[PDB]
Symmetry: D2
Subunit: 117 residues, 4 copies
């Protein structure tokens, strides 16, 4: 149910394949911030979830370097896939930029993204 092409409330394009082992692999493209064109992603998901109506746990990471640009930063998304006639992936995320140790207290942004097919 997870494999396919997804979009969020910020105009992003999330392309991902879920392997039978628990792997997540694919590409991320952001419409905002210090970013252009596509970026590599990798993560993990629960391949035998509970059967009681609970969602399926997952996560993935992007490091914001590619052939066109390097922002010296990385985002991780943590959340759950909820199946159904209108499938969704609901997340919260942490964006850390590299800093001097004197600026380390302001290194990390927090937010939330919702994805649909």
């Amino acid at each position: 149910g997870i494999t396919g092409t997804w979009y969020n409330q910020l105009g992003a394009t999330f392309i991902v394949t879920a392997g039978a082992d628990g792997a997540l692999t694919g590409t991320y493209e952001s419409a905002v911030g210090n970013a252009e064109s596509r970026y590599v992603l990798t993560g993990r998901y629960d391949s035998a979830p509970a059967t009681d109506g609970s969602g399926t746990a997952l996560g993935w990471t992007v490091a914001w370097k590619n052939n066109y640009r390097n922002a010296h930063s990385a985002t991780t998304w943590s959340g759950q896939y909820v199946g159904g006639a209108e499938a969704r992936i609901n997340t919260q995320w942490l964006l850390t930029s590299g800093t001097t140790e004197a600026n380390a207290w302001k290194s990390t942004l927090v937010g939330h993204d919702t994805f649909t097919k």
Copy 2:
């Protein structure tokens, strides 16, 4: 390689074994001493393979889904942070732990915290 590649330990007694590839990949295993977890779990992630040379740390992140051959907690953690080199190198992080829940219980699905890793001991 040297630097991030190695065996790391946090303040909760975890053992984090990782390899950093020249292509920006992180690969390895994670063992937790706390929570609904037993033995080792697979991890994967990414890092900046060309950091700034102005004294800044190196940005990185990784994910564990808590299922292996011993048990399954129906959950996953992501760690987001930076690597700082030198005589007392560290990896400094914040994390999000999401558990699978019904819709009505989604407001209490996610724990947040902070872990510091060192290569000593």
Copy 3:
């Protein structure tokens, strides 16, 4: 629509937030949750920017509830941090942290995080 932070507000979880914004920056009022280890109303206090920018920016604010009243005590506290938007509708967008008291061995799992959006028109 009715402008101003002072008023009666509802979130996407069934909660009610009743607040007054004072001229010096203070927030005072009550909070009622429809989920968790809670019943009836609880005291809150907080702060807001009483002279915000006017370049399209929202108004920054925050408040705290400790989950003890005359009916129940959950031994926990939540803080909400966010901004009053000030666009075409009355809306406040927030992120929150809920910490429960724990022993030291359980402190790693002490804190939940999430996001609530509040509107004067019940959603």
Copy 4:
């Protein structure tokens, strides 16, 4: 209210946190930051659990600063959420959210997250 949470507290970033805990559950006082767009003292208010568990658990609490005083305005607010742990090495252990006001287009980057630990013993340094 005269001891415990009440007192002068210091964190790992050089801040000074001066607070009084009332019998009624209230927190009142001043906060001074040594980093960021901030100068001199700011007003704070918050709440704590005035009847905590007796099994050895910490005391739950939270407070807010809006970063406006007579000297400057950063158009932002921070909330700290955490617990008080008493003893010879008493601490207040916290996680925090700092929201800046932004346009609707930039709302995705409005909020910083971190963690502060406070002690009643003033750090040594430096002159």
